[PDB]
Coordinates of C-alpha atoms and ligand atoms in Angstrom, one line a residue:
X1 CA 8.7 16.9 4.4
X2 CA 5.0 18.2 4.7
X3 CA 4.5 21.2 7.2
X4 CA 2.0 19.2 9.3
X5 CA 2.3 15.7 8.2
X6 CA -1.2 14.2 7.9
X7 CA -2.9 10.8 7.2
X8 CA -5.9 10.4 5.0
X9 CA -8.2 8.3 3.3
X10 CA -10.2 8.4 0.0
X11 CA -12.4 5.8 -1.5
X12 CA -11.5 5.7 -5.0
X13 CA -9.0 3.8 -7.8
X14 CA -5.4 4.9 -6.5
X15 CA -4.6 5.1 -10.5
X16 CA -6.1 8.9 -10.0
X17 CA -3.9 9.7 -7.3
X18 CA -3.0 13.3 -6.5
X19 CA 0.1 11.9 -4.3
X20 CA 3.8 12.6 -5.4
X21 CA 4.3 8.7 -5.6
X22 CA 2.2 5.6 -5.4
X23 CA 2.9 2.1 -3.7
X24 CA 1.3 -0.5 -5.7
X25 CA 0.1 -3.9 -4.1
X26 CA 2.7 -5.9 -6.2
X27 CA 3.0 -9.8 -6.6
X28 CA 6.3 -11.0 -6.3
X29 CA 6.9 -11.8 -10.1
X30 CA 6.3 -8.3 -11.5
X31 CA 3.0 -9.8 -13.3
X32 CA 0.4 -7.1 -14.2
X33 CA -2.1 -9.3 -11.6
X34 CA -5.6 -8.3 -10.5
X35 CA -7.5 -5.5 -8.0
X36 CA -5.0 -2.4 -7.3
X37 CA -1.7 -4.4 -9.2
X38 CA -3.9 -4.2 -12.4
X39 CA -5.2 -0.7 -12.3
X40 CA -1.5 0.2 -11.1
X41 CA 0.1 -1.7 -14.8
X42 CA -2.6 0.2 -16.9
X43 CA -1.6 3.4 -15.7
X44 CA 1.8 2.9 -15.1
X45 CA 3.0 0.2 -17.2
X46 CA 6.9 1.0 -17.7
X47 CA 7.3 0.8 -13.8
X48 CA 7.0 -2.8 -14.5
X49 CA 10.2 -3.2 -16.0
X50 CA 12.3 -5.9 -13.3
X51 CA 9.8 -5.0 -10.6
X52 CA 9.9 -8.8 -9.7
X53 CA 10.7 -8.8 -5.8
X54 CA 10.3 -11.1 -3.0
X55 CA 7.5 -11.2 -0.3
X56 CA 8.4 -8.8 2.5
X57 CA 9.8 -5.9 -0.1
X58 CA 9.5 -2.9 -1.8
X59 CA 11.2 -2.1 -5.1
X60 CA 10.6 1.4 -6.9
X61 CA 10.7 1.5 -10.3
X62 CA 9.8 5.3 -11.6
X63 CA 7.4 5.7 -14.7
X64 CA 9.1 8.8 -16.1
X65 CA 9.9 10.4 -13.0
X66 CA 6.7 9.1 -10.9
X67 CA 7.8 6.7 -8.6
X68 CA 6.2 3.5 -8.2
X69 CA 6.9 1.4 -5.1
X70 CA 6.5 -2.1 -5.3
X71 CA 5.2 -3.7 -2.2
X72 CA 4.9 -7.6 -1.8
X73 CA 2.6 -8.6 0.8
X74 CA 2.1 -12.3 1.4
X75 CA -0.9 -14.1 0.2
X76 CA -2.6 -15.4 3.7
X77 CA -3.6 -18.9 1.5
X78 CA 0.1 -19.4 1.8
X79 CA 1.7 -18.1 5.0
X80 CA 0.6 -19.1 7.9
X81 CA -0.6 -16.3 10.1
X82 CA 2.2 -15.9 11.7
X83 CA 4.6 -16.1 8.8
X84 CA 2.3 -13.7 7.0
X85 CA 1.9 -11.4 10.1
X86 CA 6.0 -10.8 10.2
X87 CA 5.9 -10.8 6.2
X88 CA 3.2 -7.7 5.8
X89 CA 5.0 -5.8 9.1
X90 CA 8.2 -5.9 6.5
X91 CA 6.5 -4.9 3.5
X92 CA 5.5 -1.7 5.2
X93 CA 8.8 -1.1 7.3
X94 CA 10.3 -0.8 3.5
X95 CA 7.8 0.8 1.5
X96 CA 8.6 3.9 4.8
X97 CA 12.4 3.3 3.4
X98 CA 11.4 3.8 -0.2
X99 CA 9.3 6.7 1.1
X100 CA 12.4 8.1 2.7
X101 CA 14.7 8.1 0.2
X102 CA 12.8 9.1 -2.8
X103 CA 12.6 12.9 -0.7
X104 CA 8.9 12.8 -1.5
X105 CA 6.2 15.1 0.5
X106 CA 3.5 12.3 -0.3
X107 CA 2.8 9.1 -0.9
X108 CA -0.7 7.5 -1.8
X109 CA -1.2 3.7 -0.4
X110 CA -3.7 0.8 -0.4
X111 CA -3.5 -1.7 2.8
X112 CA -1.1 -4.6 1.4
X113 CA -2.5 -8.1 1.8
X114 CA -6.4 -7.2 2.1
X115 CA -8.5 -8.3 -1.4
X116 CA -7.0 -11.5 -3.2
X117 CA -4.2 -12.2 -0.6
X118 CA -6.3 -12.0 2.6
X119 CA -7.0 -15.9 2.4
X120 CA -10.7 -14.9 2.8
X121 CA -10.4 -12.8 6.2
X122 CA -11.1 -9.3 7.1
X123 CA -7.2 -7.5 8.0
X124 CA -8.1 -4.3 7.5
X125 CA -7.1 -3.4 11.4
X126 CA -3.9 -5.9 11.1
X127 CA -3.1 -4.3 8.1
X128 CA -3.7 -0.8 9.0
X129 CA -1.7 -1.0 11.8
X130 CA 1.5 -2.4 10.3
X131 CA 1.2 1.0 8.1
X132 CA 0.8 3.0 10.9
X133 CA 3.6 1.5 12.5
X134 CA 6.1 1.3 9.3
X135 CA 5.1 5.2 8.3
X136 CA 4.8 7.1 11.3
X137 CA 8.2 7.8 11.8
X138 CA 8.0 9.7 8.2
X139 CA 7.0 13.1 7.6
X140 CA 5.3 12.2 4.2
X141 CA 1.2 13.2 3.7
X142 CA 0.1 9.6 3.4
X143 CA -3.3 9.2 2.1
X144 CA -5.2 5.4 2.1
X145 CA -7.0 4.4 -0.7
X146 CA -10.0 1.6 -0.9
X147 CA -12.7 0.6 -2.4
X148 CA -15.3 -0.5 0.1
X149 CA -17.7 2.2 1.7
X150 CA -18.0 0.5 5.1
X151 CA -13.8 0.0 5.1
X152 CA -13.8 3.9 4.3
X153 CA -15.8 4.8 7.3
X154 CA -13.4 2.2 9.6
X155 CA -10.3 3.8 8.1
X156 CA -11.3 7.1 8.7
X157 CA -12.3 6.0 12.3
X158 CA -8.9 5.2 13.2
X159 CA -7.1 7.9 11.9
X160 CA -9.4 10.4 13.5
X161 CA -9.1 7.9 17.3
X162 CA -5.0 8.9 17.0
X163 CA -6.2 12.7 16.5
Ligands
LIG201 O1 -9.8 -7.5 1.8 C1 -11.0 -7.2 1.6 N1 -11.3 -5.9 1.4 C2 -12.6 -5.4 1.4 C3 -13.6 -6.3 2.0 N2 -13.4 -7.7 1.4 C4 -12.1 -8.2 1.6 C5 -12.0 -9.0 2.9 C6 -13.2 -10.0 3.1 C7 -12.8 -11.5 2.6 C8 -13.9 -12.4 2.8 C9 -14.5 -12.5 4.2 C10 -14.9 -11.1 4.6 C11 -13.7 -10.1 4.5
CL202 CL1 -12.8 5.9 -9.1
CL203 CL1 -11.4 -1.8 0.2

């Protein structure tokens, strides 16, 4: 575990991570995709190797011995919100699972179903809050990453609201 485990957030390509493992914003077929799943395959493409998974689930697949965790959020053009509400709470709940057993003292993370699965609506808050909920029972250093300047700022607002 970390001695004081923190939360965090950096704006910047989560490909130059200085986490112990990374969660990659997987689709379900293992495809090299777009956004975070693309930078994710050119950095780490051997973790691609039966990554396929369905929505709602992590599977790690370690590049060497860096563990990537495959996260399936569901693509809001698809789910209804509902649907894809219960869908992204899950992919969270077992990316902390992944996190767990992997013994790891950090993990770096972007929020799931945001960018090209968002079906055109802001979730950072929905889906900062299913992380928050899914990881705070862990003692890993989590740190966000994102690309946005004025998501940064909103990120680092609500860490800093919970202390
Ligand atoms: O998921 C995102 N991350 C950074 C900001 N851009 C998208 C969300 C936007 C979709 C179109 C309408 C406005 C919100
Ligand atoms: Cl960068
Ligand atoms: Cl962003």
């Amino acid at each position: 575990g970390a001695m004081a485990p923190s939360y965090r957030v950096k704006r910047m390509d989560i490909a130059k991570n200085d986490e112990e493992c990374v969660v990659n914003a997987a689709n379900p077929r293992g495809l090299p995709g777009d956004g975070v799943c693309k930078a994710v395959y050119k950095k780490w493409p051997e973790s691609f190797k039966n990554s396929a998974t369905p929505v709602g689930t992590a599977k790690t697949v370690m590049c060497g011995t860096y563990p990537v965790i495959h996260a399936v959020g569901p693509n809001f053009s698809n789910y209804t919100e509902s649907e894809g509400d219960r869908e992204l709470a899950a992919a969270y709940r077992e990316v902390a699972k992944e996190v767990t057993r992997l013994g790891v003292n950090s993990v770096a993370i972007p929020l799931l179903s945001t960018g090209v699965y968002s079906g055109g609506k802001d979730r950072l808050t929905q889906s900062l809050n299913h992380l928050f909920t899914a990881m705070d029972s862990t003692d890993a250093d989590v740190v966000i990453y994102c690309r946005d300047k004025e998501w940064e700022k909103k990120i680092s607002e609500a860490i800093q609201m919970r202390t």
